[PDB]
Design a protein around this motif. Structure first.
Motif, PDB file in Angstrom:
ATOM      1  N   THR A 150       9.307  -0.904  -5.727  1.00 36.52           N
ATOM      2  CA  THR A 150       9.625  -0.506  -4.360  1.00 36.52           C
ATOM      3  C   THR A 150      10.578   0.680  -4.446  1.00 36.52           C
ATOM      4  O   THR A 150      11.304   0.814  -5.438  1.00 36.52           O
ATOM      5  N   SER A 207       8.929  10.022   2.449  1.00 35.61           N
ATOM      6  CA  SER A 207      10.265   9.701   2.936  1.00 35.61           C
ATOM      7  C   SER A 207      11.347  10.241   2.000  1.00 35.61           C
ATOM      8  O   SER A 207      12.316   9.539   1.719  1.00 35.61           O
ATOM      9  N   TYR A 239       2.905   1.297   1.984  1.00 35.57           N
ATOM     10  CA  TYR A 239       4.315   1.520   2.297  1.00 35.57           C
ATOM     11  C   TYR A 239       5.154   1.481   1.016  1.00 35.57           C
ATOM     12  O   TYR A 239       5.138   0.481   0.300  1.00 35.57           O
ATOM     13  N   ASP A 240       5.880   2.580   0.758  1.00 32.80           N
ATOM     14  CA  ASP A 240       6.708   2.738  -0.428  1.00 32.80           C
ATOM     15  C   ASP A 240       7.795   1.664  -0.489  1.00 32.80           C
ATOM     16  O   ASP A 240       8.064   1.140  -1.556  1.00 32.80           O
ATOM     17  N   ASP A 241       8.383   1.321   0.658  1.00 34.72           N
ATOM     18  CA  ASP A 241       9.422   0.306   0.762  1.00 34.72           C
ATOM     19  C   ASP A 241       8.855  -1.088   1.080  1.00 34.72           C
ATOM     20  O   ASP A 241       9.612  -2.000   1.374  1.00 34.72           O
ATOM     21  N   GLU A 280      -1.548  -2.009   4.753  1.00 36.76           N
ATOM     22  CA  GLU A 280      -1.324  -1.038   5.812  1.00 36.76           C
ATOM     23  C   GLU A 280      -2.610  -0.413   6.370  1.00 36.76           C
ATOM     24  O   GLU A 280      -2.648  -0.106   7.560  1.00 36.76           O
ATOM     25  N   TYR A 308       6.911  -5.269   8.707  1.00 36.31           N
ATOM     26  CA  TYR A 308       7.117  -5.710   7.321  1.00 36.31           C
ATOM     27  C   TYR A 308       8.616  -5.728   7.002  1.00 36.31           C
ATOM     28  O   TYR A 308       9.434  -5.185   7.743  1.00 36.31           O
ATOM     29  N   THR A 360      10.997  -4.198   9.890  1.00 36.27           N
ATOM     30  CA  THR A 360      10.594  -2.808   9.955  1.00 36.27           C
ATOM     31  C   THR A 360       9.265  -2.738  10.694  1.00 36.27           C
ATOM     32  O   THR A 360       8.307  -3.416  10.312  1.00 36.27           O
ATOM     33  N   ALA A 407       5.814  -1.125  11.538  1.00 33.52           N
ATOM     34  CA  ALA A 407       4.794  -0.290  10.922  1.00 33.52           C
ATOM     35  C   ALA A 407       4.510   0.915  11.817  1.00 33.52           C
ATOM     36  O   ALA A 407       4.838   0.919  12.996  1.00 33.52           O
ATOM     37  N   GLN A 408       3.889   1.937  11.235  1.00 37.38           N
ATOM     38  CA  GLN A 408       3.591   3.180  11.933  1.00 37.38           C
ATOM     39  C   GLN A 408       2.782   2.898  13.207  1.00 37.38           C
ATOM     40  O   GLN A 408       1.853   2.082  13.211  1.00 37.38           O
TER      41      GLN A 408
END
Ligand SMILES: *[C@@H]1O[C@H](CO)[C@@H](O[C@@H]2O[C@H](CO)[C@@H](O)[C@H](O)[C@H]2NC(C)=O)[C@H](O)[C@H]1NC(C)=O
Ligand SMILES: *[C@@H]1O[C@H](CO)[C@@H](O)[C@H](O)[C@H]1NC(C)=O
Ligand SMILES: *[C@@H]1O[C@H](CO)[C@@H](O)[C@H](O)[C@H]1NC(C)=O
Ligand SMILES: *[C@@H]1O[C@H](CO)[C@@H](O)[C@H](O)[C@H]1NC(C)=O
Ligand SMILES: *[C@@H]1O[C@H](CO)[C@@H](O)[C@H](O)[C@H]1NC(C)=O
Ligand SMILES: O=S(=O)(O)CCN(CCO)CCO
Lengths: 202, 236, 234, 204
Positions: A64, A128, B101-103, B109, C176, C180, C182-183
Motif C-alpha cells: 500500500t 496521488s 486504489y494505491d491506498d 475498483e 474503502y 474513504t 471511492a471516485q
C-alpha cells in the motif's frame, strides 16, 4: 551462528515489486534468510525468503502507498538463528518509476534563445504524488552535460517546460528523468532527443 | 478510461469446465491485480481468486482450490478464469475486477460487465462410428519358438482399418501393424497381420523372449477409436 | 528424433480436475494429429480424443466428451489433456500419441512415456474472516436517513469496503478503508467504524439508491463479503 | 435453381489442408454449398460446407496418401439442390510441399567447372514418396535463369547435387524447388544462395 544481516536496502519499483537487499556476511553452511515486513502502518505482516548480496521481493496486492513499514532479516543455519537490527522505511521515499518519454523538442514561434520540451509521464506512476524532474541538455559537440531541475504538481496536466538562456541556431541533445517528489530514487534517463532554437535574439 | 470487457454467456453440462475471458484496456495491464468474483442468482458475492499479471502469481479462495485456474496473457492484456468440475450450484454471474486504489489494495475498483455461466444438461467433428473390437484368446501361455495366432473381431465391416500394438510390462504400447497387414517401422518380420471385414489375426511366426507381452487391436476407421480388450501372451 | 515428453505424476481428490502436458520435439508440431489414450491399472486401452494443432480442431470420445478438454500451444509444441470432475475410476496412466503414418491416419505411431493420475482421498493469506450484515432487507422512503451495519468475526482495523449493486448491474465501490469515498460517489454516502463494527449511512435516500449494499473486508486473502442489505421502496 | 458448380480444383498442402475450389455460378438468392468427398479408395466419406470462387477445406486425420478420392459439390437455394459432375482425383498428384532450404553451395575440392549443392527437405515432407527437383541457376551477370531437373529415390539419403558444365571461377546464384514425383504442383523456389567455381579446367 550465521553472520548478523546488515546494510538492508529497499526499493519500490512502482506497481512492479518491492525489493530489499542486504549484506549476508560470511556464509559458512546453508543459511536461510527470512525478511519479515510489517506494513500498512503496523497493521499487516508479509514475509519473503531466500538462501545462499542477498535479495528478496514483495508484490501487489501486499503493498500500500503511502506507507510506513519495517523490515527485519532473520538468518538461520545449522548452528542457530539471528535477527538483524530493525529498519524503518517510508515507501514513497523509495519509489522508483520507469523513465519519461519525450515526443516533441522544438521552440515556440517568435521567441528566441529557448526550446520547449513536451513528454508523457511513465505509464505506471502514482497519480496521488507530485513529480520532480531533471532535464539534462548538451549541444551536438558538447561532452559535458548541463542540468536543470523543476517540479510538476499532481494536478497540473501541462507536461511542457520552457528551456531558456540558450544560444541562437544551436542544436541541443536532451534527456529527461523523473521521480515522485519525496523519493530518493530517480528514474533512468529517457532516450535522448534533439531540437534547435530560432535565429536572432528579438 | 479503464475498461474490462468479458466474454459472452456460457452453458455447460455438469462435470464440464468453463473458461471466461476478461479483456483489459486503457491502462498498463501488468501494473494492477485482477480479481474474480461470482454471484449466484439472487445471492451475494463470493471471491474466487486473483492474479498478478506482473509475474503470474495467483491466490485462490480455498473453497475452489482444486477447481479454479486464473491466468493472464500480457500480449493480449487479457485475464482468464477457468472453473472445472462444474455443478449446478456453480450457476452464477462471474465478474473480473481491477484492484486500482494505491491506498486500498484488495478492493475492487473497476468491474467487467459480467459473464453468466449456467450449468445444466441443456449445455455443452466426431466420426459417429460405433465399432466394438473383441479379442481372443484373452490370454495364452506358449514357449519360445512357437507360432502363435491371436484374433480380433469387429462388430461391423471395417475393411482393413485394423492396427495391432504390443505393450510390454511397464511400457507404452508400440504399433506393430496397421491397415491390417502393413508392418510399422522397426517391427521384426516374424510379426504379420491379415484379415478384412470383421475378422483379423496377428501371427507371431516364432515367439522370442521379448514377445511375451500384451497385444491390442484397434480399428482406425473413424472416431471414436476403440480397442480390443487385449491378449496377454505369457510364458508356459 | 521424434519425442513426446509428458508431465509428472499427479494425485487428485475426487471432484478435482487435472491437466496433463505433452511436449513434442523433433518434428513440425502443427503437421501431426495428437491423440490421448488412457489405461487404468491392469485394464485395456481407452481412446479419449484428439486435437489437430494446425487449427485447434478437436474430436472427443463421447463417453468423456463433457469432461475432457484437449488444447495445443504452437509456440511451445505442447499438447494438453484436462479431465474434469475426477472420480476414483479415472485412476490411470494417461498417454499422448502422435499419428504419423501418411497412409495410416488414426493410428498411434509415437507415444509419450505416460502420466499416472491417481484419484483418491489422499490427493495464500490464511485469513478466516466472516462478515455479517444487518438487516438483510429493509423498506425506506425517499429522503429517509438509512444506516446499514456490517460485523467482522475478528478485529480488522479499518479495512472494510462497501459496494452498491443496482438490479442487473455490476457492483460499484462506494467506500474503502471504512471511510474513504471511492471516485465519483455522492457525499450523502458515508462509512464509519473500526475493529468489528462498521456502518454505511445514506443521509437522504434518493431514487437511484434503492439497491443491494455489500460490505467486504480487504484485510488479506481470502476476501469475504457480507450477505448484503437490500434497500427496497416502502 | 443454383447454377451447377464446375471448374472443381483441388490442392493438398501437405499436412496442412486439402482445399477444393470451384466456380459457383449465378448468385440468385442464398446458396449453401456441400462438398461431398469419398476417399480411402472409396471406403470413407467426408464433407465440408460454405456459403455466399467458393472454397472448402479438409484436414487430418481425414486424409490418407496415396489416395484416389472423388469430389461432388452440391449447391442449394430456395428453388432446390443441384449437384456438379463427380470429379476424380489422386491426392499425390495435387500434393504441394513448402520449399527445400539450401545450406551449402561449394565446389568439391579440386573439381573444376562445377558446384555441389546441399539442402534439407521442407520441414513437412512425405518420407514415403520419391522426390523430384528443379535447380535454377544463373551467373551474377545474367538476367536469365538456366534450369535442370533431377530426382531422388525415397530410400536415397544423399541430399546433394553436382551442377556441372559451369564456367571457371564464376559466381552462380542458385535456387531449388521440389515436389513429390507424382505431383504437378512444385514448391515455391527456395531462398537463393550463391557459390563460386574454382579456378582452372583440369581436375586436381
Ligand atoms: C490451407 O493451407 C494453405 C497453404 O498454407 C493456406 O493458405 C495460406 O493462407 C495464409 C493465410 O490466409 C496466406 O497468407 C498464405 O499466403 C496462403 N498460402 C498459399 C500458398 O495460398 C490456407 O489458408 C489453408 N486453408 C485453411 C482453411 O486452413
Ligand atoms: C523488480 O523490478 C525490477 C525493475 O523492473 C527488476 O529488475 C527485478 O528483477 C524485479 N524483481 C522481481 C523478483 O520481480
Ligand atoms: C509515517 O511516518 C512519517 C515519518 O516518520 C510520520 O510523519 C507519519 O506520522 C507516519 N504516518 C502515519 C499515518 O502514521
Ligand atoms: C469454368 O471454366 C471455363 C474454362 O476455363 C470458363 O470459360 C468458365 O467461365 C468457368 N466458369 C465460371 C467462371 O463460372
Ligand atoms: C487409383 O487410380 C489409379 C488410376 O487412376 C489406378 O491405377 C489405381 O489402381 C487406383 N487405386 C486403386 C487400388 O483403386
Ligand atoms: O491427377 S489429378 O489432378 O488427381 C486428376 C484431375 N482430373 C479429374 C478431375 O478434374 C483429371 C483426370 O483425368
Amino acid at each position: 551462528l550465521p553472520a548478523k544481516p546488515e546494510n538492508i536496502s529497499c526499493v519500490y519499483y512502482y506497481r512492479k515489486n518491492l525489493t530489499c537487499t542486504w549484506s549476508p556476511g560470511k556464509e559458512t553452511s546453508y543459511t536461510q534468510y527470512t525478511v519479515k515486513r510489517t506494513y500498512a502502518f503496523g497493521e499487516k505482516h508479509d514475509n519473503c525468503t531466500t538462501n545462499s548480496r542477498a535479495s528478496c521481493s514483495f508484490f501487489l496486492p501486499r503493498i500500500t502507498i503511502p506507507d510506513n513499514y519495517t523490515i527485519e532479516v532473520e538468518a538461520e543455519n545449522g548452528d542457530g538463528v539471528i535477527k538483524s537490527h530493525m529498519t524503518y522505511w517510508r515507501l514513497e521515499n523509495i519509489a522508483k518509476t520507469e523513465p519519461p518519454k519525450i515526443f516533441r523538442v522544438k521552440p515556440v514561434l517568435g521567441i528566441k534563445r529557448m526550446i520547449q520540451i513536451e513528454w508523457i509521464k511513465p505509464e505506471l506512476a502514482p497519480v496521488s504524488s507530485d513529480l520532480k524532474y531533471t532535464l539534462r541538455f548538451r549541444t551536438v559537440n558538447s561532452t559535458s552535460w548541463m542540468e536543470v531541475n523543476f517540479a510538476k504538481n499532481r494536478k497540473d496536466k501541462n507536461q511542457t517546460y520552457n528551456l531558456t538562456g540558450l544560444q541562437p541556431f544551436t542544436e541541443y541533445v536532451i534527456a529527461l528523468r523523473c521521480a515522485v517528489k519525496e523519493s530518493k530514487f530517480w528514474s533512468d534517463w529517457s532516450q535522448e532527443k534533439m531540437g534547435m532554437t530560432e535565429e536572432g535574439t528579438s | 478510461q479503464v475498461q474490462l470487457v468479458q466474454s459472452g454467456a456460457e452453458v455447460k453440462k455438469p462435470g464440464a469446465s468453463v473458461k471466461v475471458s476478461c479483456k483489459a484496456s486503457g491502462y498498463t495491464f501488468t501494473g494492477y491485480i485482477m480479481n474474480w468474483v461470482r454471484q449466484a442468482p439472487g445471492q451475494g458475492l463470493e471471491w474466487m481468486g486473483l492474479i498478478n499479471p506482473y509475474n503470474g502469481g495467483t491466490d485462490y479462495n480455498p473453497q475452489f482450490q482444486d477447481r479454479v485456474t486464473i491466468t493472464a496473457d500480457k500480449s493480449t492484456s487479457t485475464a482468464y478464469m477457468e472453473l472445472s468440475s462444474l455443478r449446478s450450484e456453480d450457476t452464477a454471474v462471474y465478474y473480473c475486477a481491477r484492484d486500482g486504489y494505491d491506498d486500498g489494495p484488495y478492493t475492487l475498483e473497476t468491474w467487467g460487465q459480467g459473464t453468466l455461466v449456467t450449468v445444466s444438461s441443456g449445455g455443452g467433428g466426431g466420426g459417429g462410428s460405433d465399432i466394438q473390437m473383441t479379442q481372443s484368446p484373452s490370454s495364452l501361455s506358449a514357449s519360445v519358438g512357437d507360432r502363435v495366432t491371436i484374433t480380433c473381431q469387429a462388430s461391423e465391416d471395417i475393411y482393413s482399418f485394423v492396427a495391432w500394438y504390443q505393450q510390454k510390462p511397464g511400457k507404452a504400447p508400440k504399433l506393430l501393424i496397421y491397415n491390417a497387414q502393413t508392418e510399422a517401422q522397426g517391427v521384426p518380420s516374424r510379426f504379420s497381420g491379415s484379415g478384412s471385414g470383421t475378422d483379423f489375426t496377428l501371427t507371431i511366426s516364432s515367439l522370442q523372449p521379448e514377445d511375451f507381452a500384451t497385444y491390442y487391436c484397434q480399428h482406425h476407421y473413424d472416431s471414436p477409436l476403440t480397442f480390443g480388450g487385449g491378449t496377454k501372451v505369457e510364458i508356459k
